[PDB]
Design goal:
- Helix content is 68%, strand content 5%.
- The protein has helices at 2-9, 26-49, 59-86, 101-106, 110-125, 130-141, 153-171, 174-203, 205-208, 214-222, 224-228, and strands spanning 91-94, 97-99, 144-146, 232-234.
- The strands form two sheets. Strands 1-2 form a two-stranded antiparallel sheet. Strands 3-4 form a two-stranded antiparallel sheet.
- Helix 3 crosses helix 5 (110-125), helix 5 (110-125) runs antiparallel to helix 8 and helix 6 (130-141) packs antiparallel against helix 7.
- It binds the ligand C[C@](O)(COc1ccc(F)cc1)C(=O)Nc1ccc([N+](=O)[O-])c(C(F)(F)F)c1.
């Protein structure tokens, strides 16, 4: 039942709307990454609200958790698409926004891109199944919380525990759980580097001609700083 639901709510293809006929430029690539990010957020919200037991969380906790986990969720899914679509040869942000090394360099997000390409290769090396991927991705939504706690922290803890139990079931084992939890942990440092990048970019956006969609701008200025300042932290296994 659980996996049937995860498979059923998994978002479909999301395009960036990027102009690939134009020579690559920092401003164009980033404006497309921003637009893509916003488009995916719409789906992340619909996805999360359709997850088993998610509605139990306090209305305000639902939105906060989605906004904090947003980057990580996207990173993990992008790595999987890269692995399945182009065998980690490039980064498949979207069908119309594929990054080769040249674009990784031009986007000024080279370090982060290479870490995501490594994550992408990990799916193959570890032979991650589509079902382990789906459960791990859902678990990611419940892997970052405020030090001051949520409105209903207990309901959150219960939900996170249940998702971990589902992973146990999909695995059924010790070595596998170690492998998967280590892989999940690896997502956080990457999301952090991207968060820092997005923050610095927003602060100087008017100087580099980069366009930031409304929702993203608000989230980068209100939520992301809470993560960068340590008020909101990821939950690591290790
Ligand atoms: C530069 C930026 O547009 C920033 O987007 C943000 C996304 C979330 C957030 F909290 C702050 C910024 C970005 O990283 N976009 C982006 C778009 C799509 C994907 N993707 O589909 O996986 C990613 C990725 F997760 F890879 F890094 C990143």
């Amino acid at each position: 039942i659980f996996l049937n639901v995860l498979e059923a709510i998994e978002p479909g293809v999301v395009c960036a709307g990027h102009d690939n006929n134009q020579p690559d430029s920092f401003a164009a690539l980033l404006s497309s990454l921003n637009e893509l990010g916003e488009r995916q957020l719409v789906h992340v919200v619909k996805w999360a609200k359709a997850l088993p037991g998610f509605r139990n969380l306090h209305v305000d906790d639902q939105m906060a958790v989605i906004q904090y986990s947003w980057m990580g969720l996207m990173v993990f899914a992008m790595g999987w698409r890269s692995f399945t679509n182009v065998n980690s040869r490039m980064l498949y942000f979207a069908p119309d926004l594929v990054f080769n090394e040249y674009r990784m360099h031009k986007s000024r997000m080279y370090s982060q891109c290479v870490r995501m390409r490594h994550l992408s290769q990990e799916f193959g090396w570890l032979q991650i199944t589509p079902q382990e991927f789906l459960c791990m991705k859902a678990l990611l939504l419940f892997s970052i919380i405020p030090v001051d706690g949520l409105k209903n922290q207990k309901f959150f803890d219960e939900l996170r525990m249940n998702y971990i139990k589902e992973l146990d079931r999909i695995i059924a084992c010790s070595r596998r759980f170690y492998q998967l939890t280590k892989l999940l942990d690896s997502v956080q440092p990457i999301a952090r580097e991207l968060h820092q990048f997005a923050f610095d970019l927003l602060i100087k956006s008017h100087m580099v001609s980069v366009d930031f969609p409304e929702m993203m701008a608000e989230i980068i200025s209100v939520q992301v700083p809470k993560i960068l300042s340590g008020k909101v932290k990821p939950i690591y296994f290790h």
